[PDB]
Design a protein around this ligand. Sequence first.
Ligand SMILES: O=C1O[C@H](CO)[C@H](O)[C@H](O)[C@H]1O
Ligand SMILES: [Mg+2]
Ligand SMILES: [Mg+2]
Ligand SMILES: [Mg+2]
Ligand SMILES: [Mg+2]
Ligand code: NA
Ligand code: NA
Ligand code: NA
Ligand code: NA
Ligand code: NA
Lengths: 1015, 210
Amino acid sequence: VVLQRRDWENPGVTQLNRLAAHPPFASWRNSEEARTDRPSQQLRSLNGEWRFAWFPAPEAVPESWLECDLPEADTVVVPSNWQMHGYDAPIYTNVTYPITVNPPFVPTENPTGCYSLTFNVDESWLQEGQTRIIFDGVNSAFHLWCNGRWVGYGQDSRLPSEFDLSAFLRAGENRLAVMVLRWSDGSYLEDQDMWRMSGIFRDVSLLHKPTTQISDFHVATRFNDDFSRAVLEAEVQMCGELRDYLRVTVSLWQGETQVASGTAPFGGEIIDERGGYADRVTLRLNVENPKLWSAEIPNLYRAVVELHTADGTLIEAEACDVGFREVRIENGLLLLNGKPLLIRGVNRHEHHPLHGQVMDEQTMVQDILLMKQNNFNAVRCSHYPNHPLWYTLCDRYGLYVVDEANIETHGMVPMNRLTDDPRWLPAMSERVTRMVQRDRNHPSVIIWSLGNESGHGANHDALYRWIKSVDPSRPVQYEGGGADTTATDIICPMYARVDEDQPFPAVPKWSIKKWLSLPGETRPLILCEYAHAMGNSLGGFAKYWQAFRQYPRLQGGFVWDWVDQSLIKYDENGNPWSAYGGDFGDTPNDRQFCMNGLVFADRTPHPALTEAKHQQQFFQFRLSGQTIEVTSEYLFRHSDNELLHWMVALDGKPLASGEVPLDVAPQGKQLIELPELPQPESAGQLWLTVRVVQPNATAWSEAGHISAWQQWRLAENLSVTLPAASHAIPHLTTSEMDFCIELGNKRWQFNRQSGFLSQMWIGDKKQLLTPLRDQFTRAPLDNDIGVAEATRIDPNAWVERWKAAGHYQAEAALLQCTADTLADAVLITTAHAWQHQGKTLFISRKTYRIDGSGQMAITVDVEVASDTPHPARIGLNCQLAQVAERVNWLGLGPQENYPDRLTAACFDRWDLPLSDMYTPYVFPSENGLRCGTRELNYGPHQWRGDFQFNISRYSQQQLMETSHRHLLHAEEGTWLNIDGFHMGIGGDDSWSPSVSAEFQLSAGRYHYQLVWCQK
Amino acid sequence: GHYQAEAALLQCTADTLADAVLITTAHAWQHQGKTLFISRKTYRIDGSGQMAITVDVEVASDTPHPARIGLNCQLAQVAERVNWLGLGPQENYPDRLTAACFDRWDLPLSDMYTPYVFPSENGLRCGTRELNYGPHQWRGDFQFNISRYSQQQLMETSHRHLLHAEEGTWLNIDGFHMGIGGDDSWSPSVSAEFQLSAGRYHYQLVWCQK
Ligand SMILES: O=C1O[C@H](CO)[C@H](O)[C@H](O)[C@H]1O
Ligand SMILES: [Mg+2]
Ligand SMILES: [Mg+2]
Ligand SMILES: [Mg+2]
Ligand SMILES: [Mg+2]
Ligand code: NA
Ligand code: NA
Ligand code: NA
Ligand code: NA
Ligand code: NA
């Protein structure tokens, strides 16, 4: 029947013999164990060592496997993705399906994973009650046998499938056989932009329930106008024989105190002409002054549901954590406990670099900690229901959750081909309804989502209404078909820009500000995805946050995304490296487009994370004279774990500092008058830096955690004092090929054919390995490349425009090189033109003035043809002979910063190891720039001015020629790129030009000045 | 103290090059001991009689952003026409120049003055690459006004009919000029992107004889 029916090529069959969905059960037989959420002896884990064999098709699986272990089978850990054990390749594709688009059919060659487990069942489990097996995640479809007998079938890779094994088991040893299909009709609804894997990748458990049992329960909390009174309403359903003596007791607990309790027999109210539910009961408990749940203060109660005889016999108990909170949209605003939310959100895939799509508690906790430490309060489950533990942790640690159905049909043409088709309504409905049935009691879930990138079909509208009907407590959102359809309560676009319209036909992405006020529009707007964090990205992040704060109805967004989907591979020597699309022989593939994270796969932060943290701060600051005004953006909590530190420094030199306790109400203000500020005699800019410090450790943070900062310029005293009269004067030696300048042991060489400074000497020591030359290009960022599908090339992409214009191939042509002897200096004047196919792209005119103090003043004036694509940078570069341990600078830092991503950086004196000045993006590009630098120190060298710089062992050429970071080699000496000017990095998306006009180098004429000297 | 700031000489040197003379200057404008602006210049006069002026200005970050960054002088000459390659033909300012077109414009001198009943700074033309007046030509990328009335007289005179033509011609040539605003006229109304807030400014001009 199995091979004959081909249930995996039939959307009308998504399960066989699968039990109804429900909230998490453990069947405690002791109420105290239920209350305290301790282990239940009635819920067993079958995680561990299983037998596994791989086959190329289900037709290749031998019948013998149903009753006997296959000798060729291996013993593997479960849960697991079998690609991670090397049985076949994981496939990274974005939009295009990994299989031929021919619904409902899948390939004949359909990788088949045969799992089996021989396991013990106690006699006591079989003498009474019901023994079920629960598969929390099987990707993508499976048949199940127990002791050679066929049990059932299941689809949907991301929700639990449960089966009654009572009639199949024997006391002692039993054998399960699970046949997992890689591809099924379910795969058409699972086209998420992620690695395509398969297997038994979530927990497997065995649950014992009594014959008379709790089969479902729903918890709701409703409130009066000021939230000083609540009613908890618990609906409980039973299965078994109905009897007069049966009762349900629901008890509610605030830690160790029972705050409320209610007991009732079964028999619901009359609902229609045929009566009511005799197998259900609703308990209503009054709660005065409930402690409310939010991400800020995740107050939780425990609800215990006891099924019992009236005279006191507990049959079984179930339980959940209860968060007292109201979610509603009123007058166009999303409210949590009557207050408008500001969503500091991120999308988070379930991804581990070693284990693939298998999740563990440690990784989940690590992620939540890092998120909260970086000022996130919300997470979107892109794009499927998560491992059940995720919700428990979000409940307890406090994060707002968008729970999203496992439906994505991106690769369909058009996108709604399946979702507008009623033949596909049953399969879609199960992915939505079974999510709701499972997760509806979690307070952390505040919004339901219908899926992702499946267009807008009638099936979406039907399922939107289904949720609205069954669960009025939570808004429903869905972005497909233009982000503002009749299937969404929230305008939830992806990559809509702040100010710029993107008027695509049918599905425009309006400026978010404009979107709110379109005729007839009243809904709130929260971006489901924004600020695409691919590689060197998050340019213009502050622009979103300014808009969010100014516009009541712009209530935030979810950054895309949390973590790079890179996977670990090993080289010849067994050394690990980060791999992306195509690295497993997977083809077609979308290469690096799977890496979009604010953190690397091992959870090491990208530089972008600090920009996110800074913009997502909960305290706002204004400066008026000596007055600092602190404003809290908290809705509920006081600043009861917050101290304000302040420091005033003159060009990095500390002049004063102190601390002031913060006592700020939610949404309130506090004025801090700074003491009489000292007047520095010395020249320079005074800078004020403030930081909010948390003196006490929390569940999510260490003592001393910095949660917020800001800087201001204070007084500036411009230097008017003259540099000391240098007694010596530099000697010019003129030859046919060189202009050589000497002053003591210092020597400079300017090549007369090239027109560049080709060498410097300190004593007899060479200082340069490559000459100091202008550079107008950068090793392209992923945003410059502007690709989302590897087959596609956008002629509009910055890298394409630069390449076509000849920026990367333009050669320096010398126009002028002269030397003049001054009264206290030697002056070298140069002019160069950069040309491609007879077209002059750039002209550089320079003076080098070396005086008797040993300093070399470099003045550069550059012309850029108005019709050439604006250049990536305007600066100089050289390869120094020096390799030094440290980099010291007075500029913005300490982390990597670019013109459109530098708000988080602070102006101070920074000192770091050379390695910290390189950002190891897995796909190499221009990296590690620091902006607003007035002084740079490296080895014996010092540069002064007002410039941007990066410094590393890797040239721009190597970076642009290398696809993987692990293939980079340290070059001789150190490559230095010093920029007068540098283009924004953008990132509003990574598949179209996204650098805003104000960050493009469009001025045509540029001036900058550097002083190079020794110290 | 912007209107009463006094120029203090920091540096004034002269050098001879292979085909030119180079004059280097530095000035500080101060008020009550506070240095508001520093102007560093080079004047390069070559064998073709062209005087290349390079100007680099520091503006104290805590002083209000200045109305303009430029040079002014009273020319001995009165000439009939003003001819320029830049935005025109009418008066235009950084935040009010979209109507203006880049072209070669030639007007009588009197049209380079706008007779606002209450006198103020007026007649500026932006985005100018070449200006011609009598024997003089200025080249660069600048804003300018040219008229018989000094900035001093304009600020001291309440009514246009009370203005008297001064000897010769007042020329104001700006590397940079602040927006004029106008969202209202009773509060600061110049948008941030039109305020002269960069701290360090660079402009260059060539003065020659035509
Ligand atoms: O539109 C999207 O942008 C992301 C780009 O990485 C990713 O593909 C998301 O799954 C998708 O919803
Ligand atoms: Mg099927
Ligand atoms: Mg009791
Ligand atoms: Mg997609
Ligand atoms: Mg700041
Ligand atoms: Na808002
Ligand atoms: Na992606
Ligand atoms: Na406090
Ligand atoms: Na690269
Ligand atoms: Na006046």
